[PDB]
A paper describes a structure:
During the early steps of [name] infection, IN catalyzes the initial covalent attachment of the viral cDNA to host cell nuclear DNA. The catalytic core domain (residues 50–212) adopts an RNase H superfamily fold and contains a D,D-35-E motif that binds Mg2+ or Mn2+ ions, which mediate DNA cleaving and joining. IN function is assisted by the cellular cofactor lens epithelium-derived growth factor (LEDGF/p75), which binds tightly to a site at the catalytic core domain dimer interface. An additional class of IN inhibitors, the allosteric inhibitors of [name] (ALLINIs), act at a second site on [name] IN.
To investigate the mechanism of GSK002 resistance further, we determined three high-resolution crystal structures, one of GSK002 bound to catalytic core domain-only, one of GSK002 bound to the catalytic core domain containing the Ala124 substitution, and one of GSK002 bound to the catalytic core domain with Thr125. These two substitutions were chosen for study because they were the most influential in reducing GSK002 IC50 in the study of diverse [name] isolates. The protein structures were quite similar, with RMSDs ranging from 0.09 to 0.13 Å in pairwise comparisons. Substitutions at residue 124 could affect ALLINI binding or the catalytic core domain–CTD interaction. Overlay of the catalytic core domain•GSK002 structures on the IN•GSK1264 structure suggests a further mechanism of resistance. Larger substitutions at residue 124 and 125 would create a steric clash with the polypeptide backbone of the IN CTD, disrupting the inhibitor-mediated interaction. Thus, the larger side chains in the resistance substitutions appear to either clash directly with the IN CTD or displace the bound inhibitor sufficiently to result in an inhibitor clash with the CTD.
Author numbering:
A (entry chain A), B (entry chain A): 56 to 137, 149 to 188, 193 to 209
């Protein structure tokens, strides 16, 4: 849909938390392994994300994720308001499992899975589609 | 110059290390605050960066930064080889100083400075130029 929409959710693996951001229009992913599911971690992740892409609106499958004072502060400062996402998360979880034995740390496997996901042609890749969608929206 | 060239360097502030990546052709920046200047931190940062952008070659002002087994492993797996950068780092350091009192954590000020830097029109911004350069290179 719109090029400024991102969906953010956390998933749990090996007793750790993976924050996954999906650019809904392209299927492109950004992810980080965080110690715990806290408002401060979500707020910091949003500031990083908003500095890289033109983030207009955020969606989530857990609304209570965005109630903290810290998350509201990050969205205020950055000027952020509010099958694809389910499929992109499914694909990422599958890829982590496929590459997991190749690294010691879960965070390393997660970044290998993000790379594989973003570079896979579906014909363009999610990495190619996001830059095309954003560049076209500017011009 | 070429759209796949990035320059990576560390800078020191308040007893912490900031890893700064500059996309040479656009002036776009990605940065993270790391505990210490280690090969494992550089390797992990490179895996994240390479998953987001088409990273072909890496430059640095300190060649010894890339000698560790971990950095060479990240470049091998991701298929990475090897006034603008000086100006982009100068501007970032100036912006951190300007916004520093607005946040408790240096990492928060750093991400606010990256956002401000990438969104500032110079007429396009570094954030707009990187997506235009990469989208044009694909098509
Ligand atoms: C933790 C870690 N160590 C690594 C390496 C590579 C060498 N070493 C040293 C080493 C030496 C002897 C060993 F017996 C041993 F098991 C590992 C990667 C690493 C770095 C980059 C990378 C990959 C690996 C495995 C896999 C493909 C994608 O890119 C690691 C790695 O951790 C950091 C990325 C944090 C450095 C990991 O989680 O295994
Ligand atoms: C650590 C931190 N705490 C924050 C907040 C916001 C509210 N609080 C709670 C709070 C309550 C009462 C206070 F007296 C007090 F000082 C702070 C930001 C924060 C979050 C987002 C953000 C900004 C701030 C200050 C500045 C503009 C860009 O976006 C922080 C913040 O740390 C995290 C980003 C890790 C949450 C910080 O470093 O100050
Ligand atoms: C996004 As979950 C905390
Ligand atoms: C709080 As968010 C939009
Ligand atoms: C890039 As410095 C360690
Ligand atoms: C080691 As790097 C190219």
């Amino acid at each position: 849909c719109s090029p400024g929409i991102w969906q953010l959710d956390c998933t749990h693996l090996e007793g750790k938390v993976i924050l996954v951001a999906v650019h809904v229009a392209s299927g492109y992913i950004e992810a980080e392994v965080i110690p715990a599911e806290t408002g401060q971690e979500t707020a910091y992740f949003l500031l990083k994300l908003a500095g890289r892409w033109p983030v207009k609106t955020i969606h989530t499958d857990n609304g209570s994720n965005f109630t903290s004072t810290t998350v509201k502060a990050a969205c205020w400062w950055a000027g952020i308001k509010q099958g694809v996402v389910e499929s992109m998360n499914k694909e990422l979880k599958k890829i982590i499992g496929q590459v997991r034995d190749q690294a010691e740390h879960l965070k390393t496997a997660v970044q290998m899975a993000v790379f594989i996901h973003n570079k896979k042609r579906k014909g363009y890749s999610a990495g190619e589609r996001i830059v095309d969608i954003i560049a076209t929206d500017i011009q």
